[PDB]
Amino acid sequence: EAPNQALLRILKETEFKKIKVLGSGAFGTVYKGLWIPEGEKVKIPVAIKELREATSPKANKEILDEAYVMASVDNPHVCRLLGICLTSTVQLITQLMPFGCLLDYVREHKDNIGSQYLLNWCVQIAKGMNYLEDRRLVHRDLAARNVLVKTPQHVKITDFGRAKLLGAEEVPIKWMALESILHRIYTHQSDVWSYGVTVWELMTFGSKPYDGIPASEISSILEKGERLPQPPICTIDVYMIMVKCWMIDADSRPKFRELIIEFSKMARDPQRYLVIQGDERMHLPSPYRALMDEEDMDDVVDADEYLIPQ
Ligand SMILES: CN1CCN(c2ccc(Nc3ncc4nc(Nc5ccccc5)n(C5CCCCC5)c4n3)cc2)CC1
Numbered sequence: 001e002a003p004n005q006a007l008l009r010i011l012k013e014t015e016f017k018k019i020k021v022l023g024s025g026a027f028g029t030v031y032k033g034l035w036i037p038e039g040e041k042v043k044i045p046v047a048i049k050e051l052r053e054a055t056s057p058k059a060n061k062e063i064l065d066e067a068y069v070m071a072s073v074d075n076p077h078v079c080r081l082l083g084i085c086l087t088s089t090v091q092l093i094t095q096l097m098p099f100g101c102l103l104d105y106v107r108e109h110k111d112n113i114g115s116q117y118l119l120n121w122c123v124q125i126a127k128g129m130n131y132l133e134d135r136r137l138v139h140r141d142l143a144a145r146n147v148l149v150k151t152p153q154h155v156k157i158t159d160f161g162r163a164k165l166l167g168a169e170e171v172p173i174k175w176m177a178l179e180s181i182l183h184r185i186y187t188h189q190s191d192v193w194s195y196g197v198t199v200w201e202l203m204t205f206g207s208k209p210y211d212g213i214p215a216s217e218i219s220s221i222l223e224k225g226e227r228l229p230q231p232p233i234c235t236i237d238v239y240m241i242m243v244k245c246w247m248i249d250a251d252s253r254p255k256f257r258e259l260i261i262e263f264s265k266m267a268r269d270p271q272r273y274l275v276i277q278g279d280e281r282m283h284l285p286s287p288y289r290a291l292m293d294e295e296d297m298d299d300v301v302d303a304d305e306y307l308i309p310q
């Protein structure tokens with residue numbers, strides 16, 4: 001196979017300061033932070049994710065593996081790893097996304113969320129997924145929760161902890177495809193099914209899937225031929241696309257490139273495909289933004305605009 005020549009970058013702790021805790025879960029906590037490269041004189045807003053001071057080795061293999069994947073991908077619609085800090089315990093530095101995860105975002109802003117936005121995200125997510133397919137990577141955990149908003153217009157995929165190379169030996173039941181659920185079989189197409197759910201989450205503005213239903217339950221339910229309900233705002237076409245994602249035969253499921261194309265068409269005439277009350281009225285925020293508490297963000301540069309050789 002091809003050699004991975006991605007460069008892994010190591011950063012001194014002195015380089016960045018962690019302002020706040022974005023979230024804490026399990027043994028891992030993520031902080032909003034500012035990173036300054038050594039001679040660069042640029043300030044970068046970053047998220048630092050560190051697994052616990054507890055340094056259990058099993059965990060470490062896990063965090064490092066995720067970083068390896070993140071280091072290895074370049075796309076507008078996929079999150080990438082800025083570098084790593086080895087002090088005390090490994091931490092991952094990646095560009096901060098100000099608006100947080102999409103799933104939270106839909107729930108919070110649902111009244112103000114446009115049809116055009118929903119389709120665009122749908123298109124954007126597909127583009128990111130397609131890139132991974134190009135890189136032969138199976139995310140193996142795509143969810144609305146795992147999509148981050150740089151801006152309302154722009155979103156990218158993340159959480160590559162579960163990611164594996166295709167055909168490699170090497171738990172979100174609801175997202176998971178049936179083949180994966182029954183047989184622990186994962187393929188991009190398995191990935192595609194997950195995308196369909198993600199679309200469903202967005203379409204319903206963050207509604208839970210198979211809500212009130214136990215996970216053990218799900219395999220049979222799927223077995224029956226049951227599937228998620230058409231969302232109220234979903235036109236028959238848009239829904240129909242979703243259903244294809246949930247097909248028993250994976251080869252039957254639509255390819256990611258195909259998905260990008262179909263949604264893209266809809267985005268031209270968003271109103272036709274999604275019906276929302278007051279669609280015209282809604283508008284959404286943009287970035288200065290200075291979310292971090294700094295007087296001096298003259299030099300702030302986004303990670304997207306911050307580049308290094310190779
Ligand atoms: C209503 N609240 C909800 C929480 N909130 C918020 C959360 C995240 C962000 N942005 C942001 N950016 C990059 C991230 N990279 C990882 N995670 C991450 C994963 C792998 C490597 C490095 C970072 N995260 C995690 C995703 C899980 C939840 C905590 C933030 C990230 N989060 C901005 C605001 C403030 C508003």
Ligand SMILES: [Cl-]
Nearest residue numbers: 171172173174
């Ligand atoms: Cl689940």
